[PDB]
Amino acid sequence: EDFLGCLVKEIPPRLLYAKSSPAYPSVLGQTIRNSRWSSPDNVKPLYIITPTQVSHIQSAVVCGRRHTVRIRVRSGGHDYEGLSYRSLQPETFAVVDLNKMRAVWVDGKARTAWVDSGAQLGELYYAIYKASPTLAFPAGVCPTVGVGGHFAGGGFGMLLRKYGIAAENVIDVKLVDANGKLHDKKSMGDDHFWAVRGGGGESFGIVVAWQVKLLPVPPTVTIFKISKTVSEGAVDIINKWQVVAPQLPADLMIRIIAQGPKATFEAMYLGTCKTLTPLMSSKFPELGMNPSHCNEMSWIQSIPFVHLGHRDALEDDLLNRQNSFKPFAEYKSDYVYQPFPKTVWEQILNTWLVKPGAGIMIFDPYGATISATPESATPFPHRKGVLFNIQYVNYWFAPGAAAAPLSWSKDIYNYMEPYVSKNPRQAYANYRDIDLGRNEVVNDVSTYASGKVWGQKYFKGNFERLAITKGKVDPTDYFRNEQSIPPLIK
């Protein structure tokens, strides 16, 4: 009653929910993306707060501090492990859900915008579009991903080779810290501002809004999706790709989707078919790309096209808060610095991707701008020398059929170990993977040593600076989860 008592004093009760409340279950599930985490055996928050004003957030944090109830913040709910709305083990926590704070204010001529953390990527992209056909912002591919978690974890998509990650294009934030104080860049100091942009969600306070710079794109971009089965010589072509793709011009990204003995080469080119074809002919003719393969469209139209395959449905695809896609999902990731021997590609395509419960593998090439940024200039370390990133995606759709796909994710990660990065085995923070390791808690504080185990995988040489920053802004580890930066102090 103590915490709840505090909340009602400053926050409109229509914005507060207890498990008792009749609307609680729908408020909880509304942005859950993973059916694994909605089943009733999952630990649920004691309370849910849905602020509409920043002062509501400040009040929630103050109350939380005063009555020692911890807060997990949720924006888009896409956390792979569900850590924005569940804990792994029993504990008492409130979720602050930001889905009602979703405004996007674009300043077209200044090429900047303020975006609320509760807005979804689709909404941010659309608002930029309404302002200018030739402005863009380099973030992820999924339109329902929340801005808050995405930017905090770094965030990258089809513009990553041109402009880098979403986080390194943030010029200001509005943040509520572990004491309910509201900061921006001017008032928070450098480590905190460095850490919050890429150092992972939750750990560095609740970001209310982000100011971004908007970047130029041509009025026309070109997409292609070219498939090659192993019969068509996939293994030979993908073997070339791993060396060529990272050093293609920054205007050209070619990623690979593979879900059987067949590679799909998905490309975004910031230019026309006219100029892409000779470039392909010159730099990667092994693909056999020709003008029939070109899809010219605006940058904004490329967003639903890349994720769905649709070309027609702009407002529907970018502005959607229905969420009927709640699969059971498991994810892992890897980084690759030196080329695979062609035999590994053969095993992947012919053997591993044809197993029971086998998943999907996505290959994003780096190099160019993302790899130009020094490794420590942001908390995101996977930069110079990276050929490509790998995501291992596993979907299933029935509650009892978990064992085989889980077993495949585990088995293929083991298989790949010799061929991917090591000491540490690097991983992408926004592809959250609890099997990389979790925090131990001693005297109600996350330990540095337990945090180090996964932390060096996500953040490499930047982990210690993140922990020191944490130590400065949240020494009592108020804002934490099972995989959040532990405070390092003396």
Ligand X SMILES: *Cc1cc2c(nc3c(=O)[nH]c(=O)nc-3n2C[C@H](O)[C@H](O)[C@H](O)COP(=O)(O)OP(=O)(O)OC[C@H]2O[C@@H](n3cnc4c(N)ncnc43)[C@H](O)[C@@H]2O)c(*)c1C
User: Which residues, 406 to 445, sit near Na ion by CB under 5 A?
Assistant: 423
Integer Cα distance of 160 and 427 in angstroms: 17
Total interface residues for ligand X by CB under 6 A:
33
The verdict on 486 binding ligand X (CB under 6 A) reads no
Q: Site mask, ligand X, residues 152-191, x = CB under 6 A? A: xx-xxx----------------------------------
The helix or strand, by DSSP H or E, that contains position 173, with its residue range, turns out to be: strand 170-176
Kindly identify the residues of this chain, within the stretch 198-217, that bind ligand X according to CB under 6 A. 201-202, 206-207
**Residue 389 binding partner per list Br ion, Na ion, ligand X, none, with a CB distance cut-off of 5 to 8 Å that depends on partner kind:** none
Yes or no: say if 465 and 191 are a contact pair by the CB < 8 Å rule.
yes
Q: Which is nearer to Br ion, 225 or 262 (CB)?
A: 225
Total interface residues for Br ion by CB under 5 A:
121
The verdict on 122 binding ligand X (CB under 6 A) reads no
Yes or no: say if 321 and 118 are a contact pair by the CB < 8 Å rule.
no
In this chain, which residue has its C-beta nearest to ligand X?
201
Whole-Å CA distances, 404 to 268, 408, 435:
34, 6, 17
* Residue owning tokens 């992947």: 348
Q: Which is nearer to Br ion, 32 or 96 (CB)?
A: 32
- Residue 40, number of CB atoms within 10 A of its CB: 5
The verdict on 381 binding ligand X (CB under 6 A) reads no
The verdict on 34 binding Br ion (CB under 5 A) reads yes
Q: Site mask, Na ion, residues 374-413, x = CB under 5 A? A: ----------------------------------------
The verdict on 246 binding ligand X (CB under 6 A) reads no
Q: Which is nearer to ligand X, 56 or 78 (CB)?
A: 78
**Residue 372 binding partner per list Na ion, ligand X, Br ion, none, with a CB distance cut-off of 5 to 8 Å that depends on partner kind:** none
Among 18, 92, 108, 243, binds Br ion (CB under 5 A): 243
Integer Cα distance of 153 and 387 in angstroms: 21
Q: Site mask, ligand X, residues 58-97, x = CB under 6 A? A: --------------xxxxxxxxx--xx-------------
The verdict on 425 binding Br ion (CB under 5 A) reads yes
* Residue owning tokens 């030739």: 134
Q: Which is nearer to Br ion, 4 or 297 (CB)?
A: 297
Looking at residue 235, its amino acid is V
Integer Cα distance of 270 and 97 in angstroms: 36
Integer Cα distance of 69 and 3 in angstroms: 7
Whole-Å CA distances, 67 to 93, 175, 325, 365:
11, 21, 37, 47
- Could you tell me which stretch among 151-159, 178-186, 313-321, 465-473 binds ligand X (CB under 6 A)? 151-159
The verdict on 489 binding Br ion (CB under 5 A) reads no
Using alpha carbons only, what angle is made at residue 323 by residues 331 and 134, rounded to the nearest 5 degrees?
Answer: 85
Among 117, 394, 446, 469, binds ligand X (CB under 6 A): 117
| Strand-strand pairing, 16-18 and 70-74 | unpaired
Burial 341-353 (b: 16+ CB within 10 A, else e): eeebbbbbbeebb
Q: Provide the token pair at 313.
A: 């449905």
Integer Cα distance of 46 and 81 in angstroms: 19
Kindly identify the residues of this chain, within the stretch 104-163, that bind Br ion according to CB under 5 A. 107, 109-110, 112, 140-142, 145, 153
The verdict on 92 binding Br ion (CB under 5 A) reads no
- DSSP-derived secondary structure letter, 166: S
Q: Which is nearer to ligand X, 345 or 458 (CB)?
A: 458
Report residue 419 CA to chain centroid gap.
24
Cis link prior to 90 (omega < 30° from 0)?
A: no
- Binding positions for ligand X, rule: CB under 6 A: 33, 72-80, 83-84, 98, 117, 140-142, 145-146, 148-150, 152-153, 155-157, 201-202, 206-207, 430, 481
- Binding positions for Na ion, rule: CB under 5 A: 423
